[PDB]
Amino acid sequence: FGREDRFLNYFASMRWFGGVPLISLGKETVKQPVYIVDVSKGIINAIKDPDAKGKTFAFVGPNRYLLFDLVQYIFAVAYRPFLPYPLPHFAYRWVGRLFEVSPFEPWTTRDKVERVHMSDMTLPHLPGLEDLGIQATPLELKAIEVLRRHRTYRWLTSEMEDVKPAKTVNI
Amino acid sequence: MFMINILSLIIPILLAVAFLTLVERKVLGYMQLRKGPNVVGPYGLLQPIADALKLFTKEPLRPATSSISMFIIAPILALSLALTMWVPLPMPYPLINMNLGVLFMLAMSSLAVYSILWSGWASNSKYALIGALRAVAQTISYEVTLAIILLSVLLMNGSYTLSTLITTQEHIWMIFTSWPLAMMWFISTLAETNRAPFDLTEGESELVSGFNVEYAAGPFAMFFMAEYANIIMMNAFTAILFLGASHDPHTPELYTINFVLKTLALTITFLWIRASYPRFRYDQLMHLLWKSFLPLTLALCMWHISLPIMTASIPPQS
Amino acid sequence: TYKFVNMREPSMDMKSVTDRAAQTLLWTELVRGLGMTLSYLFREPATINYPFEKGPLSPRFRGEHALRRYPSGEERCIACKLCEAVCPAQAITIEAEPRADGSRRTTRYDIDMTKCIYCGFCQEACPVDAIVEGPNFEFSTETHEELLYNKEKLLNNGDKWEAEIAANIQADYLYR
Amino acid sequence: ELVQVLRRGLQQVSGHGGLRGYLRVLFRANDVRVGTLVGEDKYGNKYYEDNKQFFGRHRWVIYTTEMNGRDTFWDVDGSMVPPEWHRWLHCMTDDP
Amino acid sequence: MNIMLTLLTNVTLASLLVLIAFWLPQLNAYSEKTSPYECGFDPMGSARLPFSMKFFLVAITFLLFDLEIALLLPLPWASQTNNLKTMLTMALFLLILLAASLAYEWTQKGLEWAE
Amino acid sequence: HPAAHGVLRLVMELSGEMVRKCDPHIGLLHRGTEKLIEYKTYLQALPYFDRLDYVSMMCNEQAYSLAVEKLLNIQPPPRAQWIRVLFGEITRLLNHIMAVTTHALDIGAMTPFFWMFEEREKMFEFYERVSGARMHAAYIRPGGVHQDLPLGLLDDIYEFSKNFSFRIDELEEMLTNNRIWRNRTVDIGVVTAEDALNYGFSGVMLRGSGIQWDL
Amino acid sequence: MWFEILPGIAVMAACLFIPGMATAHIHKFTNGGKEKRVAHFSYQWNLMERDRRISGVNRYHVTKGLENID
Amino acid sequence: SRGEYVVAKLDDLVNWARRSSLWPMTFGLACCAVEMMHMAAPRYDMDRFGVVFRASPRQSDVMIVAGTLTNKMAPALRKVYDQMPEPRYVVSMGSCANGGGYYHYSYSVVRGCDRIVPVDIYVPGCPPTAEALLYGILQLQRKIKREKRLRIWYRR
């Protein structure tokens, strides 16, 4: 997630269609988003680390969220009305296929349909950012720099510590 | 078949505005010892097309603090009203024949100011707000004098029908009877179209871009087209009101040609005036309109009420 | 000795008062300004048809830098480093060593053209007329790096512009 | 004196090698004047002179359509002038 | 009927021009780009703050003088009445009071802007 | 801002359009010239004065050269002094053209700017012929001038000077008696002689209030 | 240039010619070729409606002369 | 192919429209802006090429950095650059803007405007002549003529 991402911006973009369609209301999906600067610094440190030559790393954030709570927090930070409704998997796949016909950059795809509603794997056997000297940046510290652009004029000046961080399913 | 006439009205007006931009650039260039656009096409004839294509292929931006609905509505209102102002003009026949064409044009002109006001307010920027308040001041300055001048001039016509002005000027131009009113009306139309020396709302030297500073790309281009169409329409209306062209019912093309040359001459006169003078201060404009134009306008209104009665020259058609 | 600019009084006779009233009501000075603009309208403009026509320049004009040669093809530069010392912007970087034949020649001669101020102090300080400012001014680039000239670039500039440079120097060397 | 200027325009039209040459010089240089030829480059640029024009318009170059490697029918620039004609063109000297 | 069609056509053309301008070009909007403009810097205050009007008195007078136009515009039709002396007397009477109202506000410093 | 000359951040407090306070913020073009000069020889420090006031270049050259000559206890030759005065008056012409035309542009008279910049271009041709540079000539140096005038320069300067008067006349025809220009300029920014002296004013800012002073 | 300003003025004049000429031609084409009737008052509208009624083809501009009075 | 020809012709049209109507921001900093004014003067008349100054960044296509960029000024230049809608171009004019020039070693001077904004054309000189600036502008036009946005999109 970052300023030019397709993760927070993507969820933020969903407000235009009125309601937020979530498969199973997002109650059966767990996400562990990671900061852009954390990933870039991890790559830089992996270049400079001699032990990181033939290893495999997993770059994940410090917190795991249910998709429903994550999207609710995203809409709360942007100060937009959150109207989640459940949509069947086949129907929302059909919506993705319909959006896939754009000759330009698609607004969403069936592959995006799948990937959004897949839970993030847990791979404790792999080294992480902390093995490269990086402390993962929580989403609650960097969400405002992405979602302040998605606010109206009336809420632009709201401070970062105003929006009651979301509940985290940490094992 | 009527929609064909609507299109044959609106589209050539847009083309005329597009080439009026080039005519302005070249005329002001030659009055400034330069040439103006002469590279993009022969004699710069392709310059307006390039300008339009560049403007409508450029990114438009919504200001973060802006009020979106009014921001989008204002240029639409401006362009639509600029196009609508042309329908009652007899050239020599009007698209819409109205009993009260002059007062209809007055009402639509009064409504047109709200595009500037609402764009300036919805931009939510200080310079745009200053431009909108200057527009309020300008309207307060010119409206009453302009309306009373129209009243006094049309007293000799006998009605508010625009096509009657051709019959009224069958033998002589109305200017030879109301030239002081003609001068005051000319200055009032200069102020009404936000043209130099009364181009206060944009205020480029002082306010950078004024009311339309936030606007970019296609929306900006529509404001420009609306302003230039209003200039041409006002000059055409002045030509009808004060320079009556002889109309032959069996050959209206002669009247059309005469009309077009007169309105082109008046538009070039605006261009010359812009090339010649500095800018007024926007309190000085109101002082000019309320302390010099208004007293003479009231006196000449009295005189033009009294004159047809004194000389037994009251026009027909109550 | 001095003069006043705004110390004239208008005459109060009926003739002058009526003339001023006619000026106020009929806008005569505004018509005078319009007439001046109309007069300029029918004049021939001062525009030239660039790039087919060019603005006039002088043999003294300071353009792109170049390194010159003797008529035998030998480099005029002797690595005396006077231009480097005098350069007000420190735009010249010079390194030198004895050549394979024992000659005093440069191995590095760089001019940072984005540091340069084109003052011509360097060509004044040169005792052998080796570094000059040429007549060329149309050498805009697309990247910053292309404006960092090394010795090869300056030698190529000299080889390319010597025909004009020698003629320009011939016309001005008696003023120097 | 109107017929005089119309005849001078017709002479400009006829002096550019015909109507096609007139439009070629009109669209390649935005200028249709006719002057005295001074010389030609080894690259194809033609240099003209007209001392009755004011200082700045009395000398001009008609650029070639094909220099070292590129097509210059439309893409011309001031850097295509060789140094000797560069000196003559910028009025650093009175001698071609 | 015709005028409604003309107005609809004009508004439709303007709206279609807006739509073309807003959907054809490439858009890259970010916070710095969409921020308020004050020539190099961030504004100190809000543009919605009260903006003083120094011509507030002339604005109120414009309201009363604008209705003078409503009473005077039927004058071309009034000149066709038989009792021309009465109409001329009342028409001249109405303008005289409008001239006197302007003279009163002028002489009592009502046309000068607030300092 | 078109009226801010590029690098002026003027923080103004407004009641309506009335100006309650002017707080000019400068330093947007502070390049540390005075510190840089300390690392240069006097000849190397001369070109900075060209860029101090870039509308009056040779005048700053002359001021710096006079200061250095006074410190050196030397005297320029008479021909150098005459050339200095001639080119200083040419520079005064350039500067007054720029000032008047940009002023009229800010009020709104945008046409005389184009008329007068052709004369300015001719004067730049004079600078380029005498020194090889159009504006930052660096011609005036401590001890005199860098180069003698090329043959034919005086005749062209005379030709320009015998015609500049009509250009002044046309400018003055467009501005002096115009009632809009007078309404925009008369009784605006009135300063008293005592205030001008006490505030450190000089030049026209002193002579406009009746003070009879010219260096 | 000064005569090079003329082509743009001519193009603008050609554009401005079109509306009035087109309006006149359309009026003639849709009104029997005789200058579309003007009805500023109710009496003129009554004349137009009577003309439409007595035409026999529901068109006011179709004019019946003395040949319709047997 | 037919689509390749269509997108090539569309690129030609758009590039011609963009390079034939180039509106630089009313923006200058120092000595160089005087030569910019002289390039706007009747002798060179940039308006004849289709080049018109516009004050608002929203209505401008090009920024000409004409003068020294100081540290105090850099945020303002970056702000006005950002507010420019796209496509936008930057032309660097003069030694000061190119690399710092004669104040390169100063404590308060940015050593080239390319540390703040991307630059398309570098115009050398101190100051560059009005003719040199016109040459740089025409070079920018030629560079715009070479853009192939729609071809690249079609080949994606």
Ligand SMILES: CCCCCCCCCCCCCCCCC[C@@H](O)O[C@H](CO[C@H](O)CCCCCCCCCCCCCCC)COP(=O)(O)OCC[N+](C)(C)C
């Ligand atoms: C109808 C309403 C909808 C469409 C809106 C657009 C209106 C039509 C567009 C008008 C097209 C005119 C542009 C052509 C002018 C080109 C001039 C010529 O010079 O171009 C040359 C070559 O041409 C260009 O390479 C391409 C131009 C033509 C583009 C292809 C035509 C595409 C038309 C497709 C129409 C579809 C419109 C959209 C429909 C929805 C390059 O030369 P250049 O470097 O400049 O000049 C050098 C300067 N010198 C001479 C002083 C030295």
Ligand SMILES: CCCCCCCC/C=C\CCCCCCCC(=O)O[C@H](COC(=O)CCCCCCC/C=C/CCCCCCCC)COP(=O)(O)OCCN
């Ligand atoms: C026998 C019975 C006859 C009945 C009476 C008839 C006689 C009437 C005689 C007097 C008529 C005079 C009419 C003029 C009305 C206004 C004149 C005026 O005084 O206005 C100026 C201001 O007006 C202007 O200067 C105009 C400013 C804007 C200039 C814009 C360009 C100038 C116009 C160009 C040419 C005009 C052509 C107009 C007609 C065009 C054709 C329709 C006053 O301002 P100040 O000098 O500042 O004095 C105020 C304090 N005393």
Ligand SMILES: CCCCCCCCCCC1=C(C)C(=O)C(OC)=C(OC)C1=O
């Ligand atoms: C309309 C006449 C052409 C104006 C060209 C725009 C000039 C932009 C540079 C800004 C500037 C202005 C306005 C200016 O007036 C000035 O002198 C004080 C400067 O110092 C060099 C400037 O940098």
Ligand code: SF4
């Ligand atoms: S011209 Fe001046 S700044 Fe440039 S290299 Fe020579 S001495 Fe240095």
Ligand code: SF4
């Ligand atoms: S160029 Fe001239 S001054 Fe510089 S090192 Fe070589 S010989 Fe010495």
Ligand code: SF4
């Ligand atoms: S490059 Fe030279 S002329 Fe331009 S601003 Fe810097 S010092 Fe002044």
